[PDB]
Design a protein around this ligand. Structure first.
Ligand SMILES: [Mg+2]
Ligand SMILES: [Mg+2]
Ligand SMILES: [Mg+2]
Ligand SMILES: [Mg+2]
Ligand SMILES: [Mg+2]
Ligand SMILES: [Mg+2]
Ligand SMILES: [Mg+2]
Ligand SMILES: [Mg+2]
Lengths: 185, 262, 131, 58, 141
RNA sequence: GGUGACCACGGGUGACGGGGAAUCAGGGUUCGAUUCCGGAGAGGGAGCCUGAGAAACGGCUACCACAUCCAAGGAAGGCAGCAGGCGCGCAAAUUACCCACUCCCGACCCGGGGAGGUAGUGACGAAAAAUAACAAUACAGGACUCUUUCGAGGCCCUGUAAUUGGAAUGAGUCCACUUUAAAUCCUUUAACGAGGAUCCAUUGGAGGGCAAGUCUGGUGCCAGCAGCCGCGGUAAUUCCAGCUCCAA
């Protein structure tokens, strides 16, 4: 019949118990620190970390010198150091278990533009990304959750068409200019 | 069903065709021919997906109907002709020739060959018998049967078909120390030298084959296609020389290639 | 025109259909997507050919504008364009006319011919009275 | 039946109908979370009141 | 104790499937008598026609009249009692209405002080009872 | 003679089988009508013609049950195909466009295909992601700092109200292009488009479990709430409301 795909998965897992003061406060601290929209962002990054830890645990229980352990562990370690959450020197499967959620959250584009200094606050960074002002390499990205890589860290900049790189000021600027010039002939 | 099937599903097609899921519901169900459909490569996907000459089935139909493809030296206008193992696809308008051979990862590779090598084709005999008037008949892995062969040729040996005549030029006996190739299973596409053949009467015999790296792998007898005498193949081998590399070595080979190019 | 450029990659020639395939990426920095006629005339300038045998299609503009990638096919002669091309690309340039009727009406007509047997006059006139 | 259905809806009928008062539109989404985070992780001041709740009616 | 032999799996499996009939959930879900006795017949909701508006006294420690409707289900024609769950929605209910009825919450069991009531009214005259209570939409007069 | 407590035989199944799905320490427990493979059926049975292949049903014959036309002599049926109705129900969409793609059939590069593709309805479900950001005044807070409480500013951070107060953008209108068989949508790009940015976020709760009010007003064992404990008989943190909070 149809040539559809219907292959999909949930990117987050809800907590087992709701209404714990400790968990609620900790997640709210993460949300406030990284300008997250709701608890689903922190839950999805928590779920990504949990999946990574699960794969690492499977490889750890797997015997050392096993070809599968070597291949998959090296692949996982190099992708972690590629996104920059793991240091270049700490390329061991044991240190994967030592990772937390904060170092994942600090690789998002929203936090990266604020840290690089293109934005005044984390929420200003999120809105600035969402209004298509920031480009990475040649491609303009409007997804705040864009996990940046180490090689792409340096190339974060403003988009050319934005009223922060090249010209063409915004509609409110142009309207104010034309109103000011129409007030004096 | 009340009769033979004439449709093939895209997801039910053989994996080595590299047919993706999204483009179509169906697959080009190969027409009946010399080779089985599970181990044949239809001309449509050969010219559309492997060489990227055509964009769709209509374009590849136009190429076929303008009579440029000579499979086994014969012009074949069938869009779903089963090419199969060790067949010559000659496009003389471009002056290019292809020997259909499995690569390392057990799937047919685009293998360009010279015109002076494209005029002969090795074949594995399948059954030998004697027809009417005491005439020795010999069938091959294709649907190709020949008469009056050399009595020295026994079953699962190799012969050299000379094209445009359908005759024998030379032959290879199947025995220990002869370079061969696996044509099915997990070891499909691997080049090695026969080292042992153990016999199980009433069952499939199993051969042990060692490649150039010394790696020993076993397979069934029916999956063995001898393609050379000793350690020298009778045809030009594909890239990689039929040497199976595990995931680590191809990973670091990719890394070395990218590092040299960058 | 001031800043609009064509670049060509994955280019190859096939005499099987006597044409040349390529994927062309256009670079319009601050403009809209460049129209297919402009693309064809610029490719004609690039490859020294009259700008009516060219065929370009499948143009996807990348996110945020700028680059736009499509497929280009340039023929050696204008005659082969009718010989081996889909009819819709010909109709876009106007070389082919598909001034035809509804598929549903064709099916109704075909079903009426099934009712009327044999007689040539009635088999061809069954579509006249129920117009 | 006991014939005592006549009281159905009594209190809701008797409750004086006071209307809602117009208020400033509440922020929603990321800004609501930002305000919520500031109200309990930025203005934190230790007090002898044993960390009164957000809805304290003192 | 229990057997542990290497080939006692038949006895272990037979004992499990024999003793699994001794807990109420498995018996209820695998005998079929509960499904036969269920007025909803294994459905989450069911439509019916209001026959009568009645009041049910609450249980002993409480003292109140719970407003319920006698309802004849359009499928299989069974009569049930459904609680009308809000402050004044019995006034929205009238005679001979197509009411949607759901379970009360704990799987064919009486809930709260209401004796023998297993169902509650979700919709009346094809308009939601919650909407009528909130005043979002009025009765179709 | 054969089969049976190593469960035959019989009965039930709200049983098509499998690849698989949900749950997710390990072990398991449920679900697999459903797009792939295999089987069966074309209202129920039964019997056949042709054909390589059918016990075919968009083939035929007969019976059983429904049901269409009729000049009453006859004749014609099989949507568990795509649409679309009725009926059943808690429960499921357009009597749309096209063979352009994937393939199939044919005497065949050319015709056909409700296979299939495309669009429509679509909060089944899954992914991403707006509903605001910033600056300066006030009044607070910080290890704030200057003299060692008193006053101020060489700083940092919230909240409340304001000609603030002028920057940024989509959501929408809409030129064109592009997509495409023709289109629609997305992506581009002109022109408008935000200060109650009234371009207005909801659904459930605030005794405990379980995050959040011993607030105010009504009712007074009534109305009602309450999955479970329980609340309600006159200052009810539990009902009905207003405000304020909480969760997503
Ligand atoms: Mg059944
Ligand atoms: Mg199944
Ligand atoms: Mg099937
Ligand atoms: Mg025939
Ligand atoms: Mg059948
Ligand atoms: Mg039949
Ligand atoms: Mg809104
Ligand atoms: Mg209240």
């Amino acid at each position: 019949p149809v040539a559809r795909s219907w292959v999909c998965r949930k990117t987050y897992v809800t907590p087992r118990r709701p209404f714990e003061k400790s968990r609620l406060d900790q997640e709210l601290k993460l949300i406030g620190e990284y300008g997250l929209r709701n608890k689903r962002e922190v839950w999805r990054v928590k779920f990504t970390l949990a999946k990574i830890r699960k794969a690492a645990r499977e490889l750890l229980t797997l015997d050392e010198k096993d070809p599968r352990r070597l291949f998959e562990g090296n692949a996982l370690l190099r992708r972690l150091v590629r996104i920059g959450v793991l240091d270049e020197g700490k390329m061991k499967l044991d240190y994967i278990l030592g990772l937390k959620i904060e170092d994942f959250l600090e690789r998002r584009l929203q936090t990266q533009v604020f840290k690089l200094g293109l934005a005044k606050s984390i929420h200003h960074a999120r809105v600035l990304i969402r209004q298509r002002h920031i480009r990475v390499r040649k491609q303009v990205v409007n997804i705040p959750s864009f996990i940046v890589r180490l090689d792409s860290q340096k190339h974060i900049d403003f988009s050319l068409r934005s009223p922060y790189g090249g010209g063409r000021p915004g509609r409110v600027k142009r309207k104010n200019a034309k109103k000011g010039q129409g007030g004096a002939g | 069903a009340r009769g033979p099937k004439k449709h093939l599903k895209r997801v039910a097609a053989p994996k080595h065709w590299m047919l993706d899921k999204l483009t179509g519901v169906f697959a080009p169900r190969p027409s009946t021919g010399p080779h089985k459909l599970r181990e044949c490569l239809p001309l449509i996907i050969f010219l559309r997906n492997r060489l990227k000459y055509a964009l769709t089935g209509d374009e590849v139909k136009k190429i076929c109907m303008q009579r440029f493809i000579k499979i086994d030296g014969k012009v074949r206008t069938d869009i779903t002709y089963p090419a199969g193992f060790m067949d010559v696809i000659s496009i003389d308008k471009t002056g290019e020739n292809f020997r259909l051979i499995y690569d390392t990862k057990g799937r047919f590779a685009v293998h360009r060959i010279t015109p002076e090598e494209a005029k002969y084709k090795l074949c594995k005999v399948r059954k030998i018998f004697v027809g009417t008037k005491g005439i020795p008949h010999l069938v091959t892995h294709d649907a190709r049967t020949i008469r009056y062969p050399d009595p020295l040729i026994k079953v699962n040996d190799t012969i050299q078909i000379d094209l445009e005549t359908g005759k024998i030029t030379d032959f290879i006996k199947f025995d220990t120390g002869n370079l061969c190739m696996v044509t099915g299973g997990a070891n499909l596409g691997r080049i090695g030298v026969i080292t042992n053949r153990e016999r199980h009467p009433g069952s499939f015999d199993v051969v042990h084959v060692k490649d150039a790296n010394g790696n020993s792998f076993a397979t069934r007898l029916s999956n063995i296609f001898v393609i050379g005498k000793g350690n020298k193949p009778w045809i030009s081998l594909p890239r990689g020389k039929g040497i199976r590399l595990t995931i680590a070595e191809e990973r670091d080979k990719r890394l070395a290639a990218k590092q040299s190019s960058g | 025109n001031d800043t609009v450029t064509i670049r060509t990659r994955k280019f190859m020639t096939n005499r099987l259909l006597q044409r040349k395939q390529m994927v062309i990426d256009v670079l319009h920095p601050g403009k809209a997507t460049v129209p297919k006629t402009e693309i064809r005339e610029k490719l004609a300038k690039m490859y020294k050919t009259t700008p009516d045998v060219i065929f370009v299609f499948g143009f996807r503009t990348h996110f945020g504008g700028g680059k736009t990638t499509g497929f280009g096919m340039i023929y050696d002669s204008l005659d082969y364009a009718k010989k081996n091309e889909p009819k819709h690309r010909l109709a876009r340039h106007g070389l082919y006319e598909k001034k035809k009727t509804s598929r549903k009406q064709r099916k109704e007509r075909k079903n009426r011919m099934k009712k009327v047997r044999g007689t040539a006059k009635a088999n061809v006139g069954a579509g006249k009275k129920p117009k | 039946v006991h014939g005592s259905l006549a009281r159905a809806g009594k209190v809701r009928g008797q409750t004086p109908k006071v209307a809602k008062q117009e208020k400033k539109k509440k922020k929603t989404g990321r800004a609501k979370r930002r305000m919520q985070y500031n109200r309990r992780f930025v203005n934190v001041v230790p007090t002898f009141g044993k960390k009164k709740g957000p809805n304290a009616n003192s | 104790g229990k057997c542990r032999g290497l080939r006692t799996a038949r006895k272990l499996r037979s004992h499990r499937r024999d003793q699994k009939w001794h807990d109420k959930q498995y018996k209820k879900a695998h005998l079929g008598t509960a499904l036969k006795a269920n007025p909803f017949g294994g459905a989450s909701h069911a439509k019916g026609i209001v026959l009568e508006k009645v009041g049910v006294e609450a249980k002993q420690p409480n003292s109140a009249i719970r407003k319920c409707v006698r309802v004849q289900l359009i499928k299989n024609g069974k009569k049930i009692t459904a609680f009308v769950p809000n402050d004044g929605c019995l006034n929205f209910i009238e005679e001979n209405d197509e009411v949607l009825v759901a379970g009360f919450g704990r799987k064919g069991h009486a809930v709260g002080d209401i004796p023998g009531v297993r169902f509650k009214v979700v919709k009346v005259a094809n308009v939601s009872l919650l909407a009528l209570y909130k005043g979002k939409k009025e009765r179709p007069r």
